[PDB]
Scaffold this active site. Structure first.
Site, short mmCIF file in Angstrom:
data_model
loop_
_atom_site.label_atom_id
_atom_site.label_comp_id
_atom_site.label_asym_id
_atom_site.label_seq_id
_atom_site.Cartn_x
_atom_site.Cartn_y
_atom_site.Cartn_z
N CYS B 105 0.83 -1.20 0.00
CA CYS B 105 0.00 0.00 0.00
C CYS B 105 0.88 1.26 0.00
CB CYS B 105 -0.93 -0.04 1.20
SG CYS B 105 -2.26 1.14 0.99
N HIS B 125 -0.16 1.42 -3.54
CA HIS B 125 -1.51 1.94 -3.70
C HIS B 125 -1.51 2.98 -4.82
CE1 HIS B 125 -5.36 3.91 -2.90
NE2 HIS B 125 -5.69 2.76 -2.32
#
Lengths: 188, 188
Positions: B105, B125
């Site tokens: 992420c 992400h």
């Protein structure tokens, strides 16, 4: 008015099935209370993750009512839920006021223990099917998420995201669920 | 010999991206240490889940070496990781001994901060892409899980299961990964 969720956290709960719904529900703007069954003290989950509850269940009980009561899974967690008279009272009250009850994995077996929602369609973890179906009081589904009336159930750790988003959709509607889903990078 | 994993937990970490790999890795028989960046005290995650670490990073540093170092995401968590000199030392040591480094992420941005793995293919992400790519030191991938040499990256909360199983497969092999996966009730 802000919707409210109660998550009941007992020793031996599946920590993934606890954290995923709490996180997702808070992303949806829901006020979530993680209530420790045994008190305010930190709770050792099934895979030894240790989570600090927001309050004791005794205290959280007094700040009701909640739009959803959430029962995580984990075999030992569900057993602790099934043996607790306080859980029985909370669930029976939620049923009577037609509030949502959500349970995942082994969690639905606490519903059987407390005589909650007989006649409903439910799912469980495959390994918990025989226990849930003792007596034929429910109808079993193999859907990853199942909702019958006010009873929402789901199957395992890997269904936790779908389970949580179903709670959001039930409380806040489809658009909020879709808005919360996009930044998570789910496959489907 | 039992494989060992270090998970570095900082304030503002994404709690789902922390608990899912810890749980899954422990299901695979890996010895996991959840080490608090700031000490042994409980850590407030991005969605206010409060997790108790197993040890301080200072203590965990002395019980090395680890077969994998795991950096969760969460924007504020990754920033705390990126600013920590102790993280830099741990990562540089892991790189030099050719151990696995896994980040999900926003977590991979700590690799850029600490000049780790330049030239590798990585993912993040989507909202963290521009930060990771400042200077063109990596090549960007949109795969849900990306592995280039000893650098394993993944995109978001919803890729956490695939991320964790990739760690298991790298450490313990495909069969253990498949055996741990089945009881989770994942879709694919």
């Amino acid at each position: 008015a802000s919707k409210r969720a109660l998550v009941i956290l007992a020793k031996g709960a599946e920590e993934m099935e606890t954290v995923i719904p709490v996180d997702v529900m808070r992303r949806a703007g829901i006020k979530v209370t993680v209530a420790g069954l045994a008190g305010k003290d930190p709770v050792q989950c099934s895979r030894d993750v240790v989570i600090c509850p927001d309050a004791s269940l005794e205290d959280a009980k007094k700040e009701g009512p909640y739009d959803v009561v959430v029962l995580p899974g984990g075999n030992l967690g569900a057993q602790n839920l099934s043996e607790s008279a306080a859980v029985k009272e909370i669930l029976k009250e939620q049923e009577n006021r037609k509030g949502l009850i959500a349970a995942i994995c082994a969690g639905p077996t606490a519903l059987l223990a407390h005589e909650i929602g007989f006649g409903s369609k439910v799912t469980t973890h495959p390994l918990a099917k025989d226990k849930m179906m003792n007596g034929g009081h429910y109808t079993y589904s193999e859907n990853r998420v199942e909702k019958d009336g006010l009873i929402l159930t789901s199957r395992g750790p890997g269904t936790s995201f779908e389970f949580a988003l179903a709670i959001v959709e039930a409380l806040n509607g489809k658009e909020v669920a879709a808005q919360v889903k996009a930044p998570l990078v789910l496959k489907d």
